[PDB]
């Protein structure tokens, strides 16, 4: 039989391993020749595997690179202008890679050039609340200072925006052992911790979903009109550079000024974590100097787009996409994901060669320039937005398949909750102590939901990956899954070797997944989800799951507002309309579910499948959220404080955030009421798409 079980059994751990090894032997930085060659290899292999068509889709987008003959570095400079300490020019390469060419040295992509000199201020994680604490409570002024911030907690682009708004003239990012060194584990290559010379690369843009900084709204094709650099979207105004903890210790150890306000500001280095500004007595005359010479350059990027045409509904697309570009070797991010995509294509292709076709069209994507701001996925979605708007059933992401070896992690729209629960009950747990049990069982035991008791945790989507344009701009149901760590017992951020030269094939094979069984489980989850979305007669979305979460979010946002009962009385601020809308959605969703169960009629089916497909679409507001025209989903958006986090009822949440500090409360509360109306109206409008159509 050609059923989901045939697809699943054809997937092999050994194949994922070989593909990962193949994809990680040299760097594949976006816009380089090696990543173009990798794109052409993937194109050829997907054709061999049996896809109907496989093309490259190219764009010319703004990228950023260090100058090879003018290296970036940071100094401590004395009174006489002698540079008495210098940060490293490269990470010491791992065993056996000491002769590998074209490893990009650590840098902050899209940093402007500059050589600012000044006194340091230490800003913890550079979060909105860290800057509140500095200015409002500690009375420390960042204006004209160089800020040093530890990585972790929030997207690094938000840290830079926060520093810029505080008046900083430069930012230094560093990896603290508190956040990147788990106690009792060795530094790479003897364990999976970040060594003192390790550095996290990464872009520091604030694109808010725009894609290529020069062409917001439109694909960066051959005839595209480009903004001038001064009008580009999301570029930082001050120089930024990342360092490791050996170098950070040299910069932090001399710090004077005010003590850290509390223990939450102290990392694990043997320094006091003084906030500054500047250095203690003996060293007060020394300054910090940055030297940044990176350049931004319009560069060609290449997506691979594979098509497996549906037999019955070829005009309905289920997309499996993940990126291919990496900072260096991409041992986890993204090649552990790309290897899984490759095996999934190979397996679908095996069935296709035996005469099988999915009901709906499956599109497979290898995205380029994800690391430079989701550029490849966003430009292709801008080029194809009308096809995606009217035909896009679901997007399943496929970046890093592992960030740990503890349990499953799923983040997705409520419309996929039931699909994921059902699929994971049919898959085998790969976990020790759960042999013969379902993945649902081990996942639910290890990762209980804090929102719904007895259920597994499923998180929200924000941004920081290639699902963003599909979900937040276009309103196509989206999800993602990977294996993860125990977040409850580990204090470290993400996985420690993220974006460092040490994130290699050996890291994965030796420490994370030697038998490739977690990769195989993730291939089954991602692949199974795609299979069901592309083959199930009735789309496997349950609108009732959206109703239950809308009520949780409505309760949550009301509870935030209710911290201000006097102002809600004064300005007549009522959530009644939102709760009414959510109640109506619950009622209508229930009736629609009844009809869905109670109908041989392919027009009623497809009419109903269209109602299911356009339900996520109904949460889009074509006017977008305030000052963020490419975040158009009213229920979810990436947090304005941290693009990685998904916020619910984001329009109301931002209207309420820090409201007590607004100079004109009547105007501020008016805008909260405006956002309640937009949210209530959108929830009711989405509900009505599920009503009988005539």
Ligand X SMILES: O=C(O)CC[C@H](NP(=O)(O)OCCC[C@H](NC(=O)CC[C@H](NC(=O)CCCCCNC(=O)c1ccc(F)cc1)C(=O)O)C(=O)O)C(=O)O
Ligand Y SMILES: *[C@@H]1O[C@H](CO)[C@@H](O[C@@H]2O[C@H](CO)[C@@H](O)[C@H](O)[C@H]2NC(C)=O)[C@H](O)[C@H]1NC(C)=O
Ligand Z SMILES: *[C@@H]1O[C@H](CO)[C@@H](O[C@@H]2O[C@H](CO)[C@@H](O[C@@H]3O[C@H](CO[C@H]4O[C@H](CO)[C@@H](O)[C@H](O)[C@@H]4O)[C@@H](O)[C@H](O[C@H]4O[C@H](CO)[C@@H](O)[C@H](O)[C@@H]4O)[C@@H]3O)[C@H](O)[C@H]2NC(C)=O)[C@H](O)[C@H]1NC(C)=O
Ligand U SMILES: *[C@@H]1O[C@H](CO[C@@H]2O[C@@H](C)[C@@H](O)[C@@H](O)[C@@H]2O)[C@@H](O[C@@H]2O[C@H](CO)[C@@H](O)[C@H](O)[C@H]2NC(C)=O)[C@H](O)[C@H]1NC(C)=O
Ligand V SMILES: *[C@@H]1O[C@H](CO)[C@@H](O)[C@H](O)[C@H]1NC(C)=O
Ligand W SMILES: *[C@@H]1O[C@H](CO)[C@@H](O[C@@H]2O[C@H](CO)[C@@H](O[C@@H]3O[C@H](CO)[C@@H](O)[C@H](O)[C@@H]3O)[C@H](O)[C@H]2NC(C)=O)[C@H](O)[C@H]1NC(C)=O
Per the annotation, binding residues for substrate are 156, 203, 370, 463-465, 480-482, 498-499, 643-644
Distance CA 620, CA 651 (A): 12
Q: Select the span of 12-20, 288-296, 432-440, 608-616 touching a second copy (CB under 8 A).
A: 608-616
Distance CA 356, CA 601 (A): 24
Residue 213 CB, nearest approach to Ca ion (Å): 9
Both tokens of 247, joined, read: 């170098």
Residue 67 interacts with ligand Y (CB under 6 A)? yes
Nearest to 414 by CA among 467, 461, 446, 450: 461
Residue 434 interacts with ligand X (CB under 6 A)? no
Nearest to 605 by CA among 615, 596, 617, 593: 596
Q: Which is nearer to Ca ion, 211 or 527 (CB)?
A: 211
Residue 119 interacts with ligand X (CB under 6 A)? no
How far is CA 505 from each of CA 33, 242, 328, 509, 521, rounded to the nearest angstrom? 21, 24, 11, 6, 19
Residue 10 CB, nearest approach to ligand X (Å): 28
From the centroid of its chain, how far is CA 522?
18
Residue 292 CB, nearest approach to ligand Y (Å): 12
Known binding-site residue numbers for Ca(2+): 215, 218, 379, 382
Helical packing angle, 602-618 and 543-561, nearest 10°: 20
Q: Is 610 a catalytic residue?
A: yes
Chain residue whose CB lies nearest ligand U:
86
Residue 282, exposed/middle/buried by CB under 10 A (0-12, 13-18, 19+)? exposed
Residue 470 interacts with ligand U (CB under 6 A)? no
Q: Which is nearer to ligand Y, 295 or 449 (CB)?
A: 295
Task: Label residues 71-81 b or e (16+ Cβ within 10 Å = b).
Answer: bbbbbbbeeee
CB 305 within 8 Å of CB 381: no
Residue 399 interacts with which of Ca ion, Cl ion, ligand W, none, CB < 5 to 8 Å by class: Cl ion
**What is the C-alpha radius of gyration for the chain, rounded to an integer number of angstroms?**
25
Q: Select the span of 179-187, 394-402, 409-417, 639-647 touching Cl ion (CB under 5 A).
A: 394-402
Q: Is 633 a catalytic residue?
A: yes
Residue 399 CB, nearest approach to ligand V (Å): 18
CB 322 within 8 Å of CB 466: yes
Distance CA 41, CA 589 (A): 46
Q: Detail the DSSP E strand segments found in 81-163.
A: 83-86, 108-109, 117-118, 120-122, 146-150
Residues 481-520, one symbol each (x = binds ligand W by CB under 6 A, - = not), give ----------------------------------------
Nearest to 690 by CA among 541, 476, 530: 541
Residue 480 interacts with which of Cl ion, ligand X, ligand Z, none, CB < 5 to 8 Å by class: Cl ion
Number of H helices, E strands in the chain: 21, 19
Judged by CB under 6 A, which of 86, 307, 389, 536 binds ligand U?
Answer: 86
Q: Where do breaks (C to N over 2.5 Å) occur in the chain, by preceding residue number?
A: 599
Residue 404 interacts with ligand V (CB under 6 A)? yes
Residues 7-46, one symbol each (x = binds ligand Y by CB under 6 A, - = not), give ---------------x--x---------------x--xx-
Residues 396-415, one symbol each (x = binds Zn ion by CB under 5 A, - = not), give ---x----------------
Residue 333 interacts with which of ligand V, Cl ion, Zn ion, none, CB < 5 to 8 Å by class: Zn ion
Residue 448 CB, nearest approach to ligand X (Å): 8
Where in 409-428 is the site for ligand W (CB under 6 A)?
418-419, 422
Residue 479 interacts with ligand W (CB under 6 A)? no
Given 91, 130, 368, 370, which residue is catalytic? Answer: 370
Q: Is 574 a catalytic residue?
A: yes
Both tokens of 176, joined, read: 């603290």
Q: Is 641 a catalytic residue?
A: no
Residue 512 interacts with which of ligand V, a second copy, Zn ion, none, CB < 5 to 8 Å by class: ligand V
- Contacts for 518 with CB less than 8 Å, ≥ 6 apart: 401, 402, 405, 430, 483, 512
Where in 653-682 is the site for a second copy (CB under 8 A)?
670, 673-674, 676-678, 680-681
Residues making contact with ligand X (CB under 6 A): 154, 202-203, 333, 370-371, 373-374, 399, 403, 407, 409, 446-447, 457, 459, 463-465, 484, 486-488, 494, 642-645
Residues making contact with Cl ion (CB under 5 A): 397, 399, 480
* Catalytic site positions: 370, 574, 610, 633
């Amino acid at each position: 039989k050609h059923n989901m079980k045939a697809f699943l059994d054809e997937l092999k751990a050994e194949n994922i391993k070989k593909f990962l090894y193949n994809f990680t032997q040299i760097p594949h930085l976006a816009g380089t020749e090696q990543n173009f060659q990798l794109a052409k290899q993937i194109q050829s292999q997907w054709k061999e595997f049996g896809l109907d068509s496989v093309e490259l889709a190219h764009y010319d987008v703004l990228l950023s690179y260090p100058n090879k003959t003018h290296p970036n570095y940071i100094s401590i400079i004395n009174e006489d202008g002698n540079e008495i300490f210098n940060t490293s020019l490269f990470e010491p390469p791992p065993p056996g890679y000491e002769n590998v060419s074209d490893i990009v040295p650590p840098f902050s992509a899209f940093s402007p050039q500059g050589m600012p000199e000044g006194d340091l201020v230490y800003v913890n994680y550079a979060r909105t609340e860290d800057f509140f604490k500095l200015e409002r409570d500690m009375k420390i002024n960042c204006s004209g200072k160089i800020v040093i911030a530890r990585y972790g907690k929030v997207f690094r682009g938000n840290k830079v925006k926060n520093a810029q708004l505080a008046g900083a003239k430069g930012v230094i990012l560093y990896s603290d052992p508190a956040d990147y060194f788990a106690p009792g584990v060795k530094s790479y290559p003897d364990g999976w911790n970040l060594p003192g010379g390790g550095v996290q690369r990464g872009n520091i843009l604030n694109l808010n979903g725009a894609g290529d900084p020069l062409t917001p709204g439109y694909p960066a094709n051959e005839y595209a009109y480009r903004r001038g650099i001064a009008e580009a979207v999301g570029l930082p105004s001050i120089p930024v550079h990342p360092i490791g903890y050996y170098d950070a210790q040299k910069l932090l150890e001399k710090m004077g000024g005010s003590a850290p306000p509390d223990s939450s500001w102290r990392g694990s280095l043997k320094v006091p974590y003084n906030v500054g500004p500047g250095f203690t007595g003996n060293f007060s005359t020394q300054k910090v100097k940055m030297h940044i010479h990176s350049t931004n350059e319009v560069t060609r990027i290449y997506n691979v787009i594979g098509t497996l045409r549906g037999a019955v509904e070829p005009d309905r697309y289920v997309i499996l996409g993940g990126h291919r570009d990496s900072w260096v070797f991409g041992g986890i991010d993204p090649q552990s994901g790309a290897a899984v995509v490759h095996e999934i294509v190979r397996s679908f292709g095996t069935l296709k060669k035996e005469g099988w076709r999915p009901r709906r069209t499956i599109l497979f994507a290898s995205w380029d320039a994800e690391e430079f701001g989701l550029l490849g996925s966003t430009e292709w979605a801008e080029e194809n937005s009308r096809l995606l708007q009217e035909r896009g059933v679901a997007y399943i992401n496929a970046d890093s398949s592992i960030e740990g070896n503890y349990t499953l992690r799923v983040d997705c729209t409520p419309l996929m909750y039931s699909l994921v629960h059902n699929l994971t009950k049919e898959l085998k747990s790969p976990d020790e102590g759960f042999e013969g049990k379902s993945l649902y069982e081990s996942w639910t035991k290890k990762s209980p939901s804090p929102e719904f008791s007895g259920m597994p945790r499923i998180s929200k989507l924000g941004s920081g990956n290639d699902f963003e344009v599909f979900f937040q701009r276009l309103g196509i149901a989206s999800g993602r899954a990977r294996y993860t760590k125990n977040w409850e017992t580990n204090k470290f951020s993400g996985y420690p070797l993220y974006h460092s030269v040490y994130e290699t094939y050996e890291l994965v094979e030796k420490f994370y997944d030697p038998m490739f069984k977690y990769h195989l489980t993730v291939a089954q989850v991602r692949g199974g989800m795609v299979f069901e979305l592309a083959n199930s007669i009735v789309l496997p979305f349950d609108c009732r799951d959206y109703a239950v979460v809308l009520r949780k979010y409505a309760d949550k946002i009301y509870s935030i507002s209710m911290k201000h009962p006097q102002e809600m009385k004064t300005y007549s601020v009522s959530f009644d309309s939102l709760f009414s809308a959510v109640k109506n959605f619950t009622e209508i969703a229930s009736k629609f579910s009844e009809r869905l169960q109670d109908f041989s009629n392919p027009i009623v089916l497809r009419m109903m499948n269209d109602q299911l497909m356009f339900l996520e679409r109904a949460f889009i507001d074509p006017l977008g959220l305030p000052d963020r025209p490419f975040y158009r989903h009213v229920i979810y958006a990436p947090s304005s404080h941290n693009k990685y986090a998904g916020e619910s009822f984001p329009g109301i949440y931002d209207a309420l955030f820090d409201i007590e500090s607004k100079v004109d409360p009547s105007k501020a509360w008016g805008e909260v009421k405006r956002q309640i109306y937009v949210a209530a109206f959108t929830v009711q409008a989405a509900a009505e798409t599920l009503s009988e159509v005539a």
